[PDB]
Each structure stands twice: as structure tokens, then as C-alpha cells.
């Protein structure tokens, strides 16, 4: 019988660890917590009983790492809609992209 | 205040399960294979 | 556990069987008992007897 | 945060204040004539009269 996260994660699997990279868009796996984002330095002073920080509406904001206990911030990678300025196909095919 | 309240409940309705086993999409895609994951996927897409 | 062919009733709801090592679980409750032969269906969520 | 964007307005606050300053200077300079046709100047006691 399992429960899926009543506690900090203690029973991991035999998958090999991977060296950490700073300030890049990566697909991390933080003891079963799968998510996307960049990993920057953080100035949020956690008390030592926390293992992760949680943002509004079930999104994870900051995670301390295994084997190092150094605090990390999760910021999502850069996104946004694309937009096209056009004068119309009757006039010209020159396109400004927003 | 009305626009901020509607925006806040639009953000906050992701935390609902809508009958699925978890609100976060990433862990249920991490822990179920698709031909029984898709029942929870359809409920999450329908609710959202 | 998965590659052992002595079992015939792995039969795992909740987390799917084929992707099980990749998650890191928190509390594992390894219970153990011995039962009557046709009571496989009653150890299941919902079936009563 | 999760894919919802707030688009900026086409008219910024300085340009809206420039529109209201154009309206204000137009009414204290002309009365009701600038809203109808060309701006015809007035003395402002004669406008209030
Ligand atoms: C394209 O533009 C020109 C001038 O702007 C106009 O005379 C012409 O009718 C336009 N083409 C169509 C198909 O409307």
C-alpha cells in the first residue's frame, strides 16, 4: 500500500542521478515531482523541515535538492503568444512578427 | 476587483480534481500508461 | 519484483505496473497475510465479502 | 503564470491625459463651437454668460 505524498519522499528507485545545471530550461525530476522550468538561485530562507515550496493552485515554486541540500527556485520557461502585423496580401507579402 | 476575482478563480480551478485521481497533470502522466490514463485525462480536460 | 515469474497476480491499480521504479514514494506499507484460494477478488477496492 | 496574458491597451495613460487636456483646453477656449465645427475663440466670462 502506497499513499503518493503524505510525506517527504523516502523510497526512491534505482535510476542513476544526473549532474545539475544552472539557469537553463530543463525537464527536472525532483523525487518523482516532474515539471518544467529554469533552476535559479533563491533567497527564500526556508526553515529546515520544508522539502518543497508550493505556489498558488497546486504548482511547485521552490525545491531543495537531494544529495546537496542547496535551495533552488523554479521559474517557468519563457512563453507567449505570437502575433503577425500584415498590410494584406493584396499589397505586399512583407511580414512583421510580434 | 471583479476581473481580478474571475482571474483568480480561473487560476484556482486547476487545483480541482473533477473526479480524477490528482489535479496535477504531470504526475498522473508519470504514473499511468495512456490506455488507463486517458479516463483521468478526459475528466481533467472536461472540467478545465 | 516485476521480473519474477513465480507470481501470477501482480494486479496493480493506482500507479501503473510498467512505470513503477521512476517515482520516488514516501511511505510503503508492506502488509502480509495468507488467505483461502478463491478470495483473490475480495482483496480489491470495492468488491466485498 | 499558466498561459493567460494581459494585453496592454492601445492608448496609454499619457495619451488619454493628452486627449482630456485637448478636450479641456478646447472647451475653456471655445465653448461648444469646437465640438460642432471649427474652434471659434471666446472670452470665458462671455462663454459662461
Ligand atoms: C488591391 O489594392 C489596390 C489599391 O490599393 C486596389 O485598386 C485593388 O482593387 C485591390 N485588389 C483587390 C482584389 O481588391
Amino acid at each position: 500500500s502506497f499513499e503518493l505524498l503524505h510525506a517527504p519522499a523516502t523510497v526512491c528507485g534505482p535510476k542513476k542521478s544526473t549532474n545539475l545545471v544552472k539557469n537553463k530550461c530543463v525537464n527536472f525530476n525532483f523525487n518523482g515531482l516532474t515539471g518544467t522550468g529554469v533552476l535559479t538561485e533563491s533567497n527564500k530562507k526556508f526553515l529546515p523541515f520544508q522539502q518543497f515550496g508550493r505556489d498558488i493552485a497546486d504548482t511547485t515554486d521552490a525545491v531543495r535538492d537531494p544529495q546537496t541540500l542547496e535551495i533552488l527556485d523554479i521559474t517557468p520557461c519563457s512563453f507567449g503568444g505570437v502575433s503577425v502585423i500584415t498590410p494584406g496580401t493584396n499589397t505586399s507579402n512583407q511580414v512583421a512578427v510580434l | 476587483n471583479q476581473n481580478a476575482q474571475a482571474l483568480n478563480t480561473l487560476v484556482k480551478q486547476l487545483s480541482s480534481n473533477f473526479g480524477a485521481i490528482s489535479s496535477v497533470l504531470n504526475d498522473i502522466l508519470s504514473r499511468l500508461d495512456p490506455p488507463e490514463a486517458e479516463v483521468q485525462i478526459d475528466r481533467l480536460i472536461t472540467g478545465r | 519484483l516485476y521480473n519474477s515469474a513465480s507470481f501470477s497476480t501482480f494486479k496493480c491499480y493506482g500507479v501503473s505496473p510498467t512505470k513503477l521504479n521512476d517515482l520516488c514514494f514516501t511511505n510503503v506499507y508492506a502488509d502480509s497475510f495468507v488467505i483461502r484460494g478463491d478470495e483473490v477478488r475480495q482483496i480489491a477496492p470495492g468488491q466485498t465479502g | 503564470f499558466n498561459g493567460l496574458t494581459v494585453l496592454p491597451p492601445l492608448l496609454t495613460d499619457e495619451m488619454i491625459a493628452q486627449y482630456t487636456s485637448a478636450l479641456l483646453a478646447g472647451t475653456i477656449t471655445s465653448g461648444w463651437t469646437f465640438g460642432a465645427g471649427p474652434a471659434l475663440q471666446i472670452p470665458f466670462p462671455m462663454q459662461m454668460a
Side-chain angles (χ1 to χ4, degrees), chain A residues 63-85:
Chain A
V63 172
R64 65 172 65 247
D65 50 6
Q67 312 154 292
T68 300
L69 273 75
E70 190 269 331
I71 190 63
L72 294 174
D73 202 5
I74 297 169
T75 310
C77 298
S78 195
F79 64 95
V82 76
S83 179
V84 165
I85 312 296

Side-chain angles (χ1 to χ4, degrees), chain A residues 2 22 30 37 43 55-56 60 63 68 78 88 90-91:
Chain A
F2 314 104
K22 216 57 64 171
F30 274 138
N43 48 309
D55 213 0
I56 302 168
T60 303
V63 172
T68 300
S78 195
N90 184 43
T91 298

